[PDB]
Structure 1
Amino acid sequence: APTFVSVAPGQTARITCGEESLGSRSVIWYQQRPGQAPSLIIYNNNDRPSGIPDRFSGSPGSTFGTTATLTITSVEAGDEADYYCHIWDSRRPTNWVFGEGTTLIVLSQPKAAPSVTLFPPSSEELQANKATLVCLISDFYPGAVTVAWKADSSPVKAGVETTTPSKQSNNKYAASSYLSLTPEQWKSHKSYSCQVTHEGSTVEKTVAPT
């Protein structure tokens, strides 16, 4: 669902949101800072409300066949947030759900590689007929999550739950991945593994029963 865009400090940003325009549009853009409330940036495309800098510009809604675009030039640290677009298309019915937001992130220091540690399910858990693999990921930047569980050759899609990444008073973010299986399944496959990719760099660590 989320879409991330990396922009160096003081450079232009490109934000895509919404479907292709079928009629004359009235695009609305919103700013949702982390933890805060969504704040308005642009209404009726390039036109803005009081107290908004001119660095934010909206693509015109007169053309057809293109997607809306919020352009931010020379991004400051405060502009980094989540941005949603509200589409008012003449050909399309009323939209009550905003479009998939774009997560703008200023680099704000050098990229860090994830530190992964995989642990087998606890022996005490086998007595309770519950088996859980824990894949820990930390010391990574930016906060991009890539979960990949491979039981030997073939993966398992269901039974996996992961949380949102959050920083813990450091550049890094906190990612924890889990997997609920059965005791007879842990002894079924020869070895499990959880692969973690970050910005195109994959890290893999395996685990085997005893």
Structure 2
Amino acid sequence: SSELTQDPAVSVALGQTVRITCQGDSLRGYYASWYQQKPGQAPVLVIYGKNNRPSGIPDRFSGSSSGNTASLTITGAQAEDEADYYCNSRDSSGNHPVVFGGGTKLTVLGQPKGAPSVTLFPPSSEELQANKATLVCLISDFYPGAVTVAWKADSSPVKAGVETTTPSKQSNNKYAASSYLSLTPEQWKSHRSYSCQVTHEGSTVEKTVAPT
């Protein structure tokens, strides 16, 4: 296609080599640049002028091009190379506006799986005295990035007042999520306990807190 295109996703095994390719008419006679972006972070230039690495970029990144395609190669991929990679050009038309590829999300396979670390906080004294009550269930360091969360009041299920996030990618490529249970102060103070139950790949971690 004439437009600047790259596959939306590709995977590579730890320590293997992967080539990310961009294709478009604007690459003809053009020295492309490439940008790495991780969730929650600004883009970082990794290749410019077809094949030049900025200072600080490791030598396992390289670039090449011919005709209407340009490629970013990662040789000996490491876990920290998991990111979205965008190619960049300027169109030959008009006054040459800047165009980005759609980005290729690179998954690095073989990273360690992990059960979630779960911390459950009770309502603070300050919040209770403000006539509100929130339990905070923080869930981190799990891989793969899928989880389900359930809450208990004493031994019974409670679903009113529950709000739970989608999992988010941490800097170590594991995932995080949080779940909040809203209660009244009188409900909190009159129960024996409340529990957060986190299920991840068939196993469950439950934490319990009690008023005191």
* Larger proportion of strand: 2
Normalising to structure 2: TM-score of the pair?
0.48
Normalising to structure 1: TM-score of the pair?
0.48
Q: Which has the larger radius of gyration?
A: 2
